[PDB]
């Protein structure tokens, strides 16, 4: 590990008096002594380049390899090419640090030249390469903004540049480096449940996709494109799951059927003299709102129901009843519960 | 806080951290509040040129903090990438107010007389660096001590030191001004340069101290 | 989880067509939401014998028909409640947790905790929920801009 | 409550006449017009505040309070007064429970 | 007065803002204006939302001034306890009102004390005392066998014990319960009615179950605290108070209290395969005795109510539940009360 500078210099001079028995004085003074300390602090130099170095290792160097990019906050820039109202008759002088002000109002972004050109004797037009003072994407400007430098001339007529900035750069946090590698490492896991959804999720116009694993077959079905599924879908997802499928493990797809239940609800209320219209009307909408909202292969059990609709209050409730619905109604993997026809009295 | 410094010819990274906090030892942590790549300082241009964000090279400014924010974390993280935007944040910002800068000149001492503009588009003017705070020392001159709905004992008797023009009401007034203008701890001093007198006009100019 | 217990209605809760005219959601899980939600769902936490504090917000979530009503909604206040609780864990015990949440991930909680105050607000007897929510809609913007400042002291 | 009193004296409180389009007039205007209809509400809640003027969400609150639930299709000024009623309901002599019949015809 | 959320607020500013000038439409997260109207209409919001919260609190406290009936505070909580001798009695040996009862269990430091004297009988061998909680709230519910020793000499004492669990200990009553006693009292002004004998017989603090039978010529009331026992000093004051209601010419009898029992044995599915331990059926118990135990005289045993109550637990871990005894709903008689009596929970 580094070692800093007062270890090197002590080395230094433990060793020269071990070798050297001509050199005995060490005031701060001797040529032999400070000759010595620029040694030490270029060695220290080097040690810190070398920990510098290290520390970019650590942090992306191991991760550069793989195909992703790193950006560092570099400041916006462009080509920008200048015009002049005749042919020049002498080498004029573009200085660094000269800088070209937006000309539109609004865009108060700023641009300055790091390096000196110089304009030939007679060329008529020259581009130079200006980077923005301000770093991240507030840099970036649409095409045809920069039309005026500060430094003025009468030979200058204007200023353009033709092509739009596009090296504007932001840079995140090692986190938001480090997630899309992981990313991109768990993407290439294959023939799994979680990655057989993962590899349907990537294509548009598939959500809420459920699978059905059995040692014989493997059967997905989905409601992805407004509640239905549609052949071409169908054919295209096919497709597209064969790198996902297991080898030598059959593939299914299907479509997704729904099953719309009856249902003549009962409720007593302990206080009569609440009941009304509007009292019902929630009610019902209420349970038809909850036996909407089931999952894929949800069984529709009774005491879940109850429990639903028993919830509303539990002062206003006292006792409830089904006329037309025995027990709970079991479903295959590939039905979904719905509200066909839903009522409820008031005893 | 901080002060300014810039690059000169062939001067290396141990002799800046020498000659301002005394030990040469601190320049290792004192190159991460410049944010520098290992070429720290380099003398050419088109060396610069390489990535230029992350050197500095002969004429480009440089960062030095105090020695007690030096081993701070948070002011290595601050310095390292807002670099000029140090002095504005440290001054602070603010909406500015100075729509009418012809104009609140001709009546002040006198209310209604400043009001919100617009600069760039869609937004509220706003004022940054040392013109905020000319602007802050310049309101504080035109308002008087009780006038502000909280915090009183804020402007100046600006308005009632209208007199004879005889020499003690220019000191008073000097006084005043003086007062008013060192109330901001952000100023060191004030101090008066030139009084003037034109029958019934005074005229007369202050210097400020402002830190760094 | 390691130092100290929780109370049982919130690690019940936890466990599990409208419009805004200035916000969209995105349903991300945080990074650290995924680790920490597994955790919550296995037993391996100690738990309380008993109950108090009935004015936290969680009761009044429970007590409102939201589940029914808008069961969507109801998913994004328990995402809201899971990024909430688990960066009130890592300051407090096992900072190890920490290099595991990004200003993204936080940013998109104010993101879906607006596209819900609005829906909210459509139906005022969610008022004391409302209320609540938004007095932590400023309270995670501060760690938004302290998280890049804090991660890198630590 | 006078968001054009009560505020730091040189921002301007009336418009500019030398040129057509003053963003600072429209803000001012803008926040006082909202604090002023604010203002208004809070005046408006006197009547809602009491039972003898109070509608809408706030007299079936006050109907669930006293016990007295709304009616389906029942308007407020019947109901206040029969909330009245019930709460000074006249019964237990054979008399009054006669005269109850009212209710039940 | 009506809920206005922030962005309506802020919708309807910056569209009165835009008016007169078209320099200011850009209203970006970044934009300072935004942030500032942003502000205004977060401060605008709460102040409608706290002001109908104060209006809805005016309400109550109006309707509170108005009759005066204040709202019940925190009751304290009681019971009895059993004091066992080393040998049978000498002498007419006597306890002062205030003498100190504590728990040495460490997990309940709560103490007890007296309110009325009590004489032990020459010859006796023990004797039931009532003890009083000086907290008040959640903390004198404690569970059986609990007060172990009566903190003072107790030359003559072996040890002391509770056969029966505390239930009186209470926290304030909610907005709810003061609604619905408050509908009670509105409902009770007209006496010579059983509704009336209701709050009658419900206006002393301490009665929390009461319920009224009636017959050709005779009125009977039933009541009991949270514990289900009767006390004669209760039914004294109970005789004392109720004097503004009862009816004229008709006789009145506060007396009878029988606690019924019935085991209940569910059969619970759990969602999840694994972790089916004894653990969770121990919580289930407690959760189903809690249930059971709160009921009153006048409520009765619904199976759909103890469904409702035994799944408030989360539906995703608790999938199904079912009973193998239970298949119709259980009248209580009048005078008796339903409650747990021994439970048997398993899986399957």
Not at chain 1, 289 to 306: A, E, F, G
Not at chain 2, 59 to 71: K, N
Request: glycine fraction near 4%; aromatic fraction near 8%.
């Amino acid at each position: 590990k580094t070692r800093k500078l007062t270890n090197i210099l002590s080395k230094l001079i433990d060793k020269t008096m071990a070798g050297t028995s001509k050199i005995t004085d060490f005031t701060p003074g001797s040529a032999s002594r400070s000759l010595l300390e620029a040694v030490s602090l270029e060695i220290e130099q080097f040690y810190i380049l070398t920990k510098e170095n290290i520390d970019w290792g650590i942090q992306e160097g191991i991760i550069e390899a793989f195909d992703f990019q790193k950006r560092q906050s570099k400041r916006a820039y462009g080509d920008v090419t200048i015009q002049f109202y005749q042919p020049l008759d002498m080498r004029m002088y573009i200085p660094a640090g000269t800088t070209f002000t937006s000309t539109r109002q609004e865009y108060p972004q700023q641009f300055e030249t790091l390096v000196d050109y110089y304009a030939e004797p007679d060329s008529t037009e020259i581009v130079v390469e200006v980077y923005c003072k301000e770093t991240g994407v507030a840099g970036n400007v649409p095409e045809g903004t920069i039309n005026t430098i500060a430094s003025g001339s009468s030979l200058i007529r204007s200023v353009n540049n033709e092509y739009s900035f596009n090296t504007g750069t932001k840079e995140e946090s090692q986190e938001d480096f480090k997630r899309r590698f992981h990313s991109f490492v768990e993407s290439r896991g294959r023939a799994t449940n979680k990655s057989v959804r993962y590899g349907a999720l990537q294509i548009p116009d598939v959500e809420g996709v459920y699978v059905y694993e059995e040692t014989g077959h493997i059967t997905v079905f989905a409601h992805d494109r407004n509640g239905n599924l549609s052949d071409t879908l169908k054919e295209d997802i096919i497709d597209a799951l064969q790198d996902y499928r297991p080898s030598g493990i059959m593939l299914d797809v299907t479509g997704v059927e729904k099953e719309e239940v009856n249902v003549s609800a009962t409720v007593t209320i302990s206080n009569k003299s609440r009941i009304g219209d509007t009292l019902q009307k929630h009610i019902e909408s209420v349970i038809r709102s909850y036996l909407n909202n089931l999952k894929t292969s949800d069984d529709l059990i009774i005491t879940d129901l109850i429990q639903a609709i028993m919830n509303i209050d539990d002062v206003l409730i006292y006792d409830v009843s089904f006329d037309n619905l025995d027990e709970n109604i079991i479903v295959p993997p590939q039905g979904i519960i719905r509200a066909g026809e839903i009522k409820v009295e008031l005893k | 806080r901080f002060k300014k410094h810039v690059v000169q010819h062939e001067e290396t990274m141990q002799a800046i951290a020498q000659r301002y906090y005394g030990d040469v030892s601190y320049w290792i942590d004192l190159v991460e509040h410049n944010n520098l790549k290992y070429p720290y300082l380099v003398e050419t241009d088109e060396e610069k040129m390489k990535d230029p964000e992350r050197l500095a090279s002969t004429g480009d400014t440089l960062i030095i903090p105090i020695e007690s924010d030096l081993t701070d974390v948070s002011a290595k993280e601050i310095n390292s990438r807002d670099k000029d935007v140090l002095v504005e944040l440290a001054l602070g910002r603010d909406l500015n107010i100075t729509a009418d800068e012809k104009y609140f000149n001709e009546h002040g001492t006198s209310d209604n007389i400043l009001a919100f503009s617009t600069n760039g588009n869609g937004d509220l003017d706003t004022v940054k660096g040392i013109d905020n705070m000319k602007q802050q020392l310049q309101a504080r001159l035109l308002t008087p001590r009780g006038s502000l709905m909280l915090h009183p004992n804020y402007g100046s008797d600006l308005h009632n030191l209208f007199g004879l023009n005889i020499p003690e009401q220019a000191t008073l007034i000097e006084m005043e001004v003086l007062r008013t203008l060192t109330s901001d701890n952000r100023v060191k001093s004030a101090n008066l340069i030139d009084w003037k007198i034109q029958g019934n006009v005074y005229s007369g100019q202050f210097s400020v101290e402002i830190k760094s | 989880n390691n130092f100290i217990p929780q109370p049982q209605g919130l690690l019940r809760f936890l466990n599990t067509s409208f419009v805004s005219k200035f916000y969209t959601p995105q349903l991300q899980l945080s990074e650290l939401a995924k680790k920490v939600l597994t955790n919550i769902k296995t037993d391996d936490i100690p738990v309380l014998e008993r109950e108090f504090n009935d004015n936290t917000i969680i009761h009044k979530a429970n007590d409102t028909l939201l589940k029914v009503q808008a069961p969507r909604m109801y998913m994004i206040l328990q995402s809201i409640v899971l990024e909430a609780y688990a960066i009130v864990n890592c300051f407090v015990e096992n900072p190890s947790s920490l290099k595991y949440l990004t200003e993204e991930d936080v940013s998109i909680t104010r993101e879906n905790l607006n596209y819900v105050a609005d829906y909210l607000g459509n139906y005022d007897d969610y008022n004391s929920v409302v209320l609540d929510l938004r007095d932590l809609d400023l309270c995670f913007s501060a760690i938004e801009l302290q998280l890049p400042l804090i991660k890198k002291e630590a | 409550a006078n968001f054009l009193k009560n505020l730091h004296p040189l921002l301007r409180r009336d418009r500019n006449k030398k040129d057509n389009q003053d963003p600072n007039f429209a803000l001012i205007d803008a926040l006082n017009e909202e604090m002023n209809q604010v203002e208004k509400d809070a005046i408006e809640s006197k009547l809602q505040s009491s039972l003898k003027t109070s509608t809408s969400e706030y007299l079936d609150k006050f109907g669930d309070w006293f016990g007295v639930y709304r009616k389906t299709d029942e308007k407020d000024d019947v109901y206040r007064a029969r909330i009245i009623k019930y709460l000074l309901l006249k019964r237990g002599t054979n008399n009054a429970i006669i005269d109850a019949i009212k209710d039940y015809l």
